[PDB]
Structures are given as structure tokens and as C-alpha cells.
Write a protein that binds this ligand. Structure first.
Ligand code: HEM
Ligand code: HEM
Lengths: 147, 148
């Protein structure tokens, strides 16, 4: 299990303003994997129109949802196995809308970048490792959707 | 037995056009039946006066988003709801821990049907009503396991 106290304490820095911190995660995501941008712009096209996609209700609602799923991983940090079936269903939904499984690895890198910006020196190697472990467990359960 | 998938998918698309409004409908009905559930969302909205101010609290609104995500998962796995059984039992355990009485989940069922009836109107046909009753029936059965 990822160290529960390290996870809970560090998550409090970002969890209460999910769009402020979530937009940081997604800005990093696009800087590391620019090719993801057309996938969101096309999703925006389906919802309404692609203009101002990164300010759109569907794009910001998606950030809120990513932050909510990360919060569930935090509240279930002691036994992440219980989320496995929920996450497998979410992973299968992503594959069905055309998201690459490899893009989830960039989300992990972006999650660590967002946390470090907020925590600075409090983001110790132990805390970074805990988050690496927690996110690893999340992406592993979501990857079941690729079965 | 198994909730008719197309009736579930079709009706859920309509309700997820406005999740915050429709989720608020579900909780408004639930609070009219069991007003004592509202304080469970007041941990950062500590007021006995005008407690409706707390329906605009982030914890209440994020919880609506959480409820919609769970239903979204039940809709995605509508062809095999047993696939969510261990997750739902753990989710049941979490609700028992915050102090939700097991009987309050029968009231959630009534509130869900009320919410679906309000937003769907004539589209909430006897067949669509039966599919949602079967879907909630399966969800609440797995959730009840969290009480042991
Ligand atoms: C890897 C980068 C990702 C991309 C390109 C992506 C894309 C999408 C798309 C296109 C949708 C459907 C429409 C929408 O909700 O705006 C979606 C839904 C969703 N995503 Fe993502 N997503 C990604 C990562 C994630 C991650 C990491 C999480 C959670 C940890 C997440 C959670 C969700 C949720 C909860 C939904 C709603 C699914 C549903 O409608 O049932 N997404 N995502
Ligand atoms: C009487 C009805 C209910 C009450 C009073 C209630 C109350 C709560 C409270 C107090 C929490 C903990 C704080 C929070 O995460 O927001 C919570 C969490 C949660 N609730 Fe509910 N809830 C109810 C119904 C439901 C239903 C019907 C669903 C799903 C269909 C649901 C899904 C969730 C989820 C996903 C969590 C997060 C649990 C976790 O962190 O793993 N709730 N609920």
C-alpha cells in the first residue's frame, strides 16, 4: 500500500481547489504529449464547438472528474483493491472513446509535476514514491479495460 | 432480471445532459423524506440556520458528481453488474462509517426513481422504470454487504 499518512497530508495541498491544480496537471500533460490536444478539441466539437475547448464546461468537468477519481484513490489508499472493478470500467470507457493507454503514463508524470508545484520541499522522495505507487495502482486497474 | 441495456443507456444520456441539476433533484427528494441526512454534508458548512446554503457547498456538489460517477459505472457495466460487486460493497462500508443507516438506501432508491420520473417525463415508461428498479436493486444489494 502507498504510505497512507504521506498520501493524505500531501493531497490536502491540492484537493480543495481541484480546477486550480487540475488545470496545472493538464497544462503539463499537453506540454509532454501535444498530440492529446486534438483528441480533446474533437471531443469539444461533439459537445458544442472546438473553439475555447480548454475553457469549455466538458473539458473542465473532465478535470473535476480526474481529481475526484484521484480523491477516491486517496480515501481507499489502505486497500486500493476495492477500487479495481470501478477503475477497470473507467479504463474500458476511455478505450471506447479512443484514448491511448500510453497517455495514462503522461498523466502520472503530470500528477507528480502538479503536486511538486504546490508542495515544493515538502514533496520528499518518500512522498513522490508514495504517489508513484498510488498512481501505478490506479493505472494498473484502468488498464484492465484494454482486456 | 438484467436491466435492459438500451433503455438504461438511452435514459441515462438524457439525465447526464445536466448532472448537477438532476443530482440536486435526487438529493432534494431524499432530504424531503429524511432531512437528517443533510448534516452528513455539513462538515464544512456548520450552520443549523438556513441549512439549504449548504446545498451550494463544494462537499455537497462534489458528492453529487461522485454519485453520478458510480451510476455512470453501473451504466457502462449494465450487461454484467456483478463485475462491480466488491467495489459497491466497499462503497457501502464507507457509507456505514459516516453514519448512513442501511434503511436510508431504500429512500435513495425512491429518490432516484423520483429524479428519473421528473427529468424523463413520458420517456419514463413502465419498461424504463422496471430497468432502473432492477439496476438500483442490483447496486443496493451489493452496497448492503458493507453492513456485513
Ligand atoms: C489519459 C488522458 C485522458 C484523456 C485523453 C481522457 C479523455 C476522456 C474522454 C474523451 C472522456 C469522455 C468525455 C468527457 O468526459 O469529457 C473521458 C471521460 C472520463 N474520464 Fe478521462 N481522459 C483521460 C484521463 C483520465 C484520467 C487519468 C481519469 C481518472 C483518473 C479520467 C477520468 C474520467 C472520468 C471519470 C470520465 C467520465 C467517463 C464517463 O462518461 O463515463 N480520465 N475522458
Ligand atoms: C443517503 C444517501 C447518501 C449519503 C448521506 C451519502 C453521504 C456521503 C458522505 C458523507 C460521504 C463522505 C464524504 C464524501 O466523499 O463526499 C460519501 C462518499 C461517497 N458517496 Fe455517498 N452518500 C449517499 C448516497 C450515495 C449514493 C447513492 C452513491 C452512489 C451511487 C454515493 C457515492 C459516494 C461515493 C462514490 C463516495 C466516495 C467514497 C470514497 O471516497 O471512496 N453516495 N457519501
Amino acid at each position: 500500500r502507498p504510505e497512507p499518512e504521506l498520501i493524505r497530508q500531501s493531497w490536502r495541498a491540492v484537493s480543495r481547489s481541484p480546477l486550480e491544480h487540475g488545470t496545472v496537471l493538464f497544462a503539463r500533460l499537453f506540454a509532454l504529449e501535444p498530440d492529446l490536444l486534438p483528441l480533446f478539441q474533437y471531443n469539444c466539437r461533439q459537445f458544442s464547438s472546438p473553439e475555447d475547448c480548454l475553457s469549455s464546461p466538458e473539458f473542465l468537468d473532465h478535470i473535476r472528474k480526474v481529481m475526484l477519481v484521484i480523491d477516491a484513490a486517496v480515501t481507499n489508499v489502505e486497500d486500493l483493491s476495492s477500487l479495481e472493478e470501478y477503475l477497470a470500467s473507467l479504463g474500458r470507457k476511455h478505450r471506447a472513446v479512443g484514448v491511448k493507454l500510453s497517455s495514462f503514463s503522461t498523466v502520472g508524470e503530470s500528477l507528480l509535476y502538479m503536486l511538486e508545484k504546490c508542495l515544493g520541499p515538502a514533496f520528499t522522495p518518500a512522498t513522490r514514491a508514495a504517489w508513484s505507487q498510488l498512481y501505478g495502482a490506479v493505472v494498473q486497474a484502468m488498464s484492465r479495460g484494454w482486456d
